Amino acid sequence: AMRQCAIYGKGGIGKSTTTQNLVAALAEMGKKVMIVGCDPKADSTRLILHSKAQNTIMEMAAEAGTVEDLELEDVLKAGYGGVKCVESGGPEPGVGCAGRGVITAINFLEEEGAYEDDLDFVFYDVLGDVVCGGFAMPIRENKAQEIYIVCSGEMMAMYAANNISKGIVKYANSGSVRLGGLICNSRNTDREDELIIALANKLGTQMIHFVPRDNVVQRAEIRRMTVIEYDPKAKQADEYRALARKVVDNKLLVIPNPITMDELEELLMEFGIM
């Protein structure tokens, strides 16, 4: 078996930094992991690959002719800890549907046998500002059973978490896609941990970890690494190790309870963030 997880959240919230660091910690533990980039920004694997980014399945298929002229061994790339990496890509802005590459990529990976029995985890790093087209496909088509939402005390980040949760509810009659937890990626604001705990409890889930804001992230990423690789002794490395451990041990996977805008505003008012 293998655990199929998707990391969702609003743009810029920390999906790719959190996912790559979490996965590096899993590999450090001895887990075998694949990352599938499902964000048109297409830099979801650069810290594992020590790279600028990674050429996408949509780009590679265009240069080869069709996606069927591609070989899995040509597409998947291994980096830190043996973690395997692939990027979906997407059409250029103004053209088509921004999520269409996600559908092509996941179907290619399934057909070509990328989901080998030896994998322990697959993580999809998915744009979450809209829940439609290929960005909804991991939920609609039962590809990621465990959804973890990166968020913060930012109102927009909590709104996104609620919207993603509504998408999970919409498809709960089929498949087995569930909300596994919220990950708070701190803005260094007071009571932020308490705020995201409260939001998680209203949705029916949990705050699986509070990730501190730490400049070592920038120093590692300038060098194209995870903090796990850049400085294994860093306090922030231990934070990502704690998040990884709690993901491994997590057994709470729920159909969430989306909240009203009034509930969200009351959360913000109560914990004095605003």
| Residue 202 designated active-site | no
Handedness of CA 38, 211, 214, 187 (dihedral sign): positive
Is 100 a binder of ligand ADP (CB under 6 A)? no
SS3 151: strand
| Residue 246 designated active-site | no
Q: Return the amino acid letter for 190.
A: D
Q: Return the amino acid letter for 270.
A: E
| Residue 41 designated active-site | yes
Among 4, 13, 16, 144, binds Mg ion (CB under 5 A): 16
Is 20 a binder of Mg ion (CB under 5 A)? no
| Residue 15 designated active-site | yes
Find out whether 101 and 88 touch, Cβ atoms under 8 Å.
Answer: yes
Q: Check 31, 39, 125, 129 and give the catalytic one.
A: 129
Is 94 a binder of a second copy (CB under 8 A)? yes
Which of the residues 60 through 119 are near ligand SF4 (CB under 6 A)?
Answer: 97-99
Taking CB under 6 A as the rule, which mask of x and - marks residues 141-180 in contact with ligand ADP?
Answer: --------------xx------------------------
SS3 214: coil
Smallest CA-to-CA distance from 220 within 235, 242, 203, 210 is with 235
Which of the residues 211 through 230 are near a second copy (CB under 8 A)?
Answer: 218, 222
Is residue 84 within a helix (H) or strand (E), and if so which, with residue range? strand 84-87
| Other Cβ atoms closer than 10 A to 131 | 21
Name the DSSP letter for residue 254: B
Q: Which is nearer to ligand ADP, 165 or 185 (CB)?
A: 185
Applying CB under 5 A, which residues contact Mg ion?
Answer: 15-16, 39
**Would you list which residues are annotated within the binding site for ATP?**
9-16
Where in the sequence numbering do the catalytic residues fall?
10, 15, 41, 129
